[model samples]
Target: MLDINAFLVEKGGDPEIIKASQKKRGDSVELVDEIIAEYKEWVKLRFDLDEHNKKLNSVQKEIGKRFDLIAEKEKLSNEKKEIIEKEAEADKNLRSKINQVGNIVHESVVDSQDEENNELVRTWTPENYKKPEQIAAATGAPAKLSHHEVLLRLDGYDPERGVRIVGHRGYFLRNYGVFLNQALINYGLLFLSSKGYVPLQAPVMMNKEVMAKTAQLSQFDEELYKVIDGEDEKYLIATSEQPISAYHAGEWFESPAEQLPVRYAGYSSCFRREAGAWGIFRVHAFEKIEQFVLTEPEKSWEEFDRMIGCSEEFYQSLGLPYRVVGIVSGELNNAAAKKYDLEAWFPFQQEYKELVSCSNCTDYQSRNLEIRCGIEKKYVHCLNSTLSATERTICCILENYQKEDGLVIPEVLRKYIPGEPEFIPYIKELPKNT
Candidate 1:
């Protein structure tokens, strides 16, 4: 099966052998079967080699006492060589038929493929989790504005020229939009810093080898941007987590179990080849404040829950209602042992959309990165979650706080927003304070 071939390729298969050996069939389903057949032949050849080797061993023992059988030993040795060659050929043929397939889904405890079947592990808020507060009286409710509308009306967003100059999915966030974005990032940094997370400004690009080890390339290579024009191969990072994870690659720590959970809050500009990214939901470039941890195996889940709580608090501070969902096995990637996604409420859409994802990768990533803990030399457990993504948060804020006058900035972000606690009215100025 191509799945077999894919695994063979990843495990170590000769590319030329695999390509030339594939059956002359266009259908992948049939090709998978043919490759599978090749493996059976390889197994049979191994058996033959073992039998021939046993016969050769017998003949070698006979040459001393039965000196006349020396000639017999030569014959058996020759046959053994022939058998070995046949085995080698069979192995090669089998490998050739199976290389270059797809991602290998690893085993996990949570066994369902369907998302609806995902285990609901925890719920933090009551029934009105998605509810928002309104400031304008006479029962003033938040007005709905498409983020596109808010961007155009108040933030000086120029989509037409953005696409014209930078190509599709390109836009310039001028004036307040840029400030709003920076303010969101600063707010997240401040919060994470207060929580004992070491602030980091990570590299935006890295080698493909490190990326591959993190299991990111195989899953998102199509969406990865390779720097072909550079001195050596490199890729623009899709997430800050990649660089942060790789930073500990092939490294060991001397810290004891008591200081086990070391957290990092990273800030970076992330890029992706969102080929058909629609609207602002899936954009090519964005800013993120990310949280990553290196903890003992037993403490990984404890840190996972803590990370989820941090993101929840961040959203709650912004008056953004959100819910956490546990990842099902089929929905889970190879690296994460378990995952929790924080989906923020989009008041306008009356739906919750994913904003942050918290994961306890267990030892999966640590093993790949060669990170170890204490004198025991055991792999450290790794975890990562999003604290804030500037663009997406802006979208949520715009929808949740859109008033008839203008968008009201979340109170937590006010200090960063210059001269006002919230966004000012577009055309009409608010009456001056008494």
Candidate 2:
């Protein structure tokens, strides 16, 4: 570092010469000369690229002059022959199909085949997060109850009959299952409604054209359930966000600044043909409440943060421990400019599971829907984040809230639940209060 600039004959002699000297520092003289030669070749190629553009301009001018002459003498045999030769010459110049161009990628673009490229932002957890065995040790006098065990005991899941009726990985939720499911929906609806988000019950199925307009099109092909085989194609939506985001398809918003940042909370039953290891965690059908925002330009980022805050409040109120992670570029879905995932802690499994996804798709979805705002009528930004999904939330609560006597419901859900105690296999008394 000390000698690099000092070795120069004059301060900053020729930048390139200094650069070449730097290159020569740790390299053989021959290698440095080769590097310089390659740099020179790049400079020469840039000039060649310019010359080639000039040639294209010359060809275009000649074609225009000939076309005007040919149009004036349309019926003339000589004129027809002249245009034919010009067309032949144009064809001769093209090495491939018309409009196809060579590929030259940007320097900063990156590609990787796996999740090894993923980046983690931060992890969050409650202070009491502990090993399952450690939890059992602290709260003596009872057995540890897993979510699957609780659901089975309470008649929430009937996987056996479900498979007989709906095939593999199918499940039925009944009794308190249905009640708790509805409670989650009600809680999410009230939470978002309080924040000024308009409530929407979106369609469960959408036509191919409209579905294609949303970013969920790829899922329609690979992950969605399609009906009416090969004709008038229809698809069951995989998320409420898709249909809700497309609510303003081909529409414009000319509202003032305060009126903008239109937000919606959508509820729907989603269907998917998920291709993965199958279980209750990876299922074909589930109910979800999704949040979508159509915001003015430059305000989407703020809206994104606000959405994440709302989700955090919802999860925190439920007393569920979770970690928020920033999704790396490579892990992002097709439409997301940036994304954040909140994964809930699964105590029994001692693992974190994805509970909600928040994405600032920016103009991606709005452009697809042709949604615009302001007098200038520029495309607005679009965002979608999960408020809650009933199934996964049920899983989290069943695992996290099991007490010595029975399960305890989160205080927030008490008003939504029909009866008191919010747990089955009721215990009349506790031996000692923890």
Candidate 3:
């Protein structure tokens, strides 16, 4: 939830800035005016209600002093009740309007709706590899195997049987695929753990209240899966960051200055509806290691850079060629003030696809969860970044590391695998099949 007060000019806030942010996001700029108008109505009604209550109280006090005051007290009491109802209604409307507004966009965000307008931050390529376009041109043809094709050749994936069993976008990661998936997860955990991030295996399900605070539930409801158990309802987490953000809900840090910048490497299996995508790139279920942080408001951007840097380091260690792009305001999520995506190059597709997203949510989520810090109990800024999304990373690895004969395991993940096999040979045929 945004601080409604920040949209009220009477409260020393700047409504124009919020309006500007809305314009950048291609959102409703007029909504800001509606919010302001609703707030004013609520405030005025509150003031009138307070005055009416005071009058009612005085009338009651005078009733014992004079018989004439008894009727006046009853009338004042009736008026106060009516005012209370109106004030309550006004308050509800104000809050509902405010909830519709998104977080103010960071000034640095590119002002566009199209992702193609995203500002490129930087790129990282393997020592001998050229830029994605150059490499595509150099090959002059698509690779012999796509990611899924490579998995098939290695006898590691069974999408046909998997779909029959679990529906679309479902697949079995057999043999080396299982090993590679687990290896990526282990590598991600170890990488972040070595950087002082506390690793946590977070719950995959969250209750409605917590989920709403952690994400824009109204907007993402279609993407979320809800479980109904008798009278209880829970939503499966789309990312570990959702649960990790809610871990400290409705709590105040005892000593924020001393205990600022709490970091966690949260691990969980995430679920999504994934309405419009194919294959593993977008899936109903996937494993992820997420980086979540809670820090003082003033130092959040510093922490943001640190978090993205950690992600960059993790990818570099795996030797994956990637680029970072600043997400345009229109593409930014409701909770994020600013966001950057690390897109890994897929040689088979001749494109870069998002593998990790790092966001500075600022105080947006904390306000919703009531996560406060410091002596003044101000909302702490929340940040989350992807350490690894194993399935997608596996796709990139299979493509970039593919050879005509086999696929090479990344050096960083070699030690995590059972036999430390450097290469997984392609299988000529399935043995003893019908």
RMSD of each: 8.6, 11.7, 3.0
Q: If scored against the real structure, what TM-score would every candidate get? A: 0.72, 0.70, 0.94
The residue-by-residue lDDT of candidate 2 on 1-434, one tens digit each, is 11122223354423344333333222222433343344444445445545545655565566677535444333344444554565454443331211111111112222332444434655655455543332421222133555666566666677779889999778888767787888899999999999999999999988888887674434655888888855576888899987888888888887738768888989999887973532356678989999999889779878988998999889888877777776544455656656788888777666677889998876656765788777723778888999997887888787777665556666788777677455566333323334
Per-residue alpha-carbon lDDT of model 1 for 213-289, expressed as tens digits?
A: 77543555477788875578788888899999888888787674677678999999998886353345568888999
Which candidate number would show the highest TM-score if scored against the true structure? 3
For model 3, residues 333-407, the per-residue Cα lDDT tens digits are: 788899999998888887888999999999888988899887723889999999889988888787877776778
Query: Which pairs clash in model 2?
Result: none
In order, the Cα lDDT scores of the candidates are 0.70, 0.66, 0.84
Q: Considering lDDT, which of the candidate structures 2 and 3 is the better prediction for this target?
A: 3
Instruction: Note the residue pairs that clash in candidate 1.
Output: 1-32, 5-98, 6-101, 18-96
Winning model by lDDT: 3
Using lDDT as the measure, name the better of candidate 1 and candidate 3. 3
What's model 1's overall lDDT? 0.70
Error of 2 at 165 (Å): 0.4
- Candidates, ranked, TM-score: 3, 1, 2
Compared with the true structure, model 1 gives a TM-score of 0.72
Comparison by lDDT, 1 against 2, better one: 1
Q: What is the descending lDDT order?
A: 3, 1, 2
> Candidate 2's C-alpha lDDT?
0.66
